[model samples]
Target: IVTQTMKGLDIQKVAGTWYSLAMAASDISLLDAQSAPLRVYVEELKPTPEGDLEILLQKWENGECAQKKIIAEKTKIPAVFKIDALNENKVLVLDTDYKKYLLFCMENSAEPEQSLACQCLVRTPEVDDEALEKFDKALKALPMHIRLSFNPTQLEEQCHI
Candidate 1:
């Protein structure tokens, strides 16, 4: 679904912690994993001797890091993967400044022809104009995508699941 190239992906620069600002899911239930403020943690990204990026995708929940919990519904699996774990799951890195922002799209053709989801990564909660501009344009073009605003819910309560 991507028309543009990845713009020369520099893995070392791209390797770090990234906060998810927005995401859109085709299934309503799938998007309800966390109450609000979704994020992606890129850790232990080392080059496999085979030239693939090995990574541990830790999960975040309710606007904070929830690595101590174990239940599935608490967050996504802390899955370890190479860049192309599933040969069919194609991920395109459209744009990234390495330090400030990164915009990428992931699609599994086998799931549904048009089932594509994109997410925005920021250095912090507040993203700058340049990065926000790119994110806004992409979001506008994709109507089915959802805006994942950071709303901390049940701040005092803990979610076991």
Candidate 2:
């Protein structure tokens, strides 16, 4: 179960390539029938001491572009994370942005699926609880025939990270 303390996370350390386990495209055929290679990526962001946030947009394809920029006053909250428990699951709450609160379920592992067990970005903390609950329900509701690809596992082999 997820706790309230695990709401916001300072994702500064995670500001790099994150593989997507599932296809983000609406059409599965597009992903399956790709003539060229496609990739999934997530760029980490953090707020500077001067009250600004740095943004980096990374791409998955070999010929894609990843842009980095530092903007002023993009986020009000300072980027930070607090550990609430040791034995139990540790939560990382991030209040860096106005509309979204980032939450990460952290563990000690090199793999994204093993390390960051669960992750959610919600519009509000109050709604985050419900969102998390719903996410849990969705996971539980999955059928036996269907499989879950937490994050892109193929990227690990391809990138050699």
Candidate 3:
């Protein structure tokens, strides 16, 4: 099962802070409660001059917030990107309403066991049923087994970085 990227995505409109409402991973353990440090907070998105995308995300690490910047190199396809940090990574924007929610899919070849991860992010900490429906639809289409992790908002206040 291959997930597709959203058509005619307006990067500028989607560029902003987004809260992680749900996360799914091929390896169930990766999304388990003990993996809180792996939760992600999207801080911002910036389009580079070369038409690439800059993703600034915050994550909890060692009792503090950690920041990481990843450059999504542009591909011939508009919403598909290649992330250089990983050995083999393809990031796709599965769906987004711009204002309400954003669904993202990532395939990381570097970690064969945990190759796929799909995330549902919302403009606010709360999510709408409509947004969740889209996320559910996307997850159902995945080929591998998946486990879900919910409500990372618990770290919302601490991860303000």
Return the top candidate by TM-score: 3
52-124 in candidate 1: lDDT tens per residue? 4544444555565555321111012112121343444555566788788877665554453255566666665
Regions of candidate 2 where Cα sits further than 4 Å from its true position: 1-40, 60-152, 155-161
Error of 2 at 127 (Å): 24
lDDT by residue (1-161, candidate 3, tens digit) is 34477999777677777777677777655555432623566667777867788998876666667777988898898788898774668888888988989888777755534577778778876656777788888788675455553454552654532
TM-score, cand. 1: 0.61
Model 2 lDDT per residue over 31-111, tens place: 332222222223445555553444442443444444334232422333323233343323333222334434333332233
List candidate 1 segments past 4 Å from native. 35-51, 60-87, 110-113, 151-161
Ranking by TM-score, best first? Answer: 3, 1, 2
Q: Pick the candidate with the highest lDDT.
A: 3
Model 1 / residue 126 / CA error / Å: 3.3
RMSD of 1: 7.9
Q: Cα-based RMSD of the predictions, in order? A: 7.9, 14.3, 3.2
- Which portions of model 3 miss their true places by more than 4 Å? 33-38, 109-114, 143-155, 159-161
- TM-score each candidate: 0.61, 0.29, 0.81
